[PDB]
A paper describes a structure:
To gain structural insight into how FOX proteins bind to the TP53 promoter, we determined the co-crystal structure of FOXL2-DBD in complex with the p53-DNA (5′-AAATATTTATTATCGA-3′). Unexpectedly, two FOXL2-DBDs (FOXL2-DBD1 and FOXL2-DBD2) were found to bind to p53-DNA with a 2:1 stoichiometry in the crystal structure. FOXL2-DBD1 binds to the FBE (5′-TATTTAT-3′, hereafter FBE1) in the major groove of p53-DNA through the α3-helix, whereas FOXL2-DBD2 binds to another major groove (5′-ATTATCG-3′, hereafter FBE2) adjacent to the FBE1 site, with two overlapping bases. Both FOXL2-DBD1 and FOXL2-DBD2 showed a typical winged-helix structure, consisting of five α-helices, two antiparallel β-strands and two characteristic flexible loops, which are referred to as wings 1 and 2. Since the complementary sequence of the FBE1 site (5′-ATAAATA-3′) belongs to the typical FBE 5′-RYAAAYA-3′ (R = A or G, Y = C or T), the binding mode of FOXL2 to DNA was distinct from the crystal structures of other FOX proteins, i.e. the direction of FOXL2 was opposite to that of other structurally characterized FOX structures, with wing 1 heading to the 5′ site of p53-DNA. In FOXL2-DBD1, His104 made direct contact with the base of T8, and the N atom of Asn100 interacted with the base of A11′ (2.3–3.5 Å). The N atom of Arg103 formed a network with the base of A5 (3.0 Å) (top). These results suggest that FOXL2-DBD1 binds to the FBE1 site first and, subsequently, the minor groove width becomes narrower to create the new binding site FBE2 by increasing its binding affinity via DNA allostery.
Most FOX proteins bind to the typical FOX DNA-binding element (FBE) 5′-RYAAAYA-3′ (R = A or G, Y = C or T) to regulate the transcription of their target genes. Here, we found that FOX family proteins bind to the non-canonical homotypic cluster of the p53 promoter region (TP53).
Author numbering:
A (entry chain B): 1 to 89
B (entry chain A): 2 to 94
Write the structure that this text describes.
DNA sequence: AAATATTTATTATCGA
DNA sequence: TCGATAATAAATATT
């Protein structure tokens, strides 16, 4: 019972390293973040767009190809082989 | 050829240098160019500086635009006390 | 008209 | 009072 004002930044690449295959999608993001804590909600476009723009400022992300496991838009999103050893932690 | 001039005063001067005084945001730059052309649109560096003046003041108001004026930007105007203050001492050193 | 990602754009924090 | 990192709204491009 307290205020979580800190978890808007590192919730993006988290689902990469918390997982085992390191390429979970927005579906896995949603279901796992929901399964984690009992207050946050996906029924708000505000917080959704907030977490959406949290990915553009820092210049370390990149787009990586994927086949028809859900690809109609195009490639998935992950990190760069350079800013690697700073996101496992 | 950028100006060493007060940027809030730059916005207010652009304001008084018009009749409608409520032009769109995407034209604001052009007007400053009309005075002192230096900057290039590709340079994304010094934008936050002008932003600091645009957002942080106490003589402007924020009012939502009309749905037909659907572009990127809003309209701003001055304050009567700010008007009568700037009308006297606007261009000193 | 509802919800993915390259640019734009208020509140406020730091630093000079 | 002029500049550099973060944290937040509302309107284009993309599927």
């Amino acid at each position: 019972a307290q205020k979580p004002p800190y978890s808007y930044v590192a919730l993006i690449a988290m689902a990469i390293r918390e997982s085992a295959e390191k390429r979970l999608t927005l579906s896995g993001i949603y279901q796992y973040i929901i399964a984690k804590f009992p207050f946050y909600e996906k029924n708000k476009k505000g917080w959704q767009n907030s977490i959406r723009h949290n990915l553009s400022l820092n210049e370390c992300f990149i787009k990586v190809p994927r086949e028809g496991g859900g690809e109609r838009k195009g490639n998935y999103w992950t990190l760069d082989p350079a800013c690697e050893d700073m996101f496992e932690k």
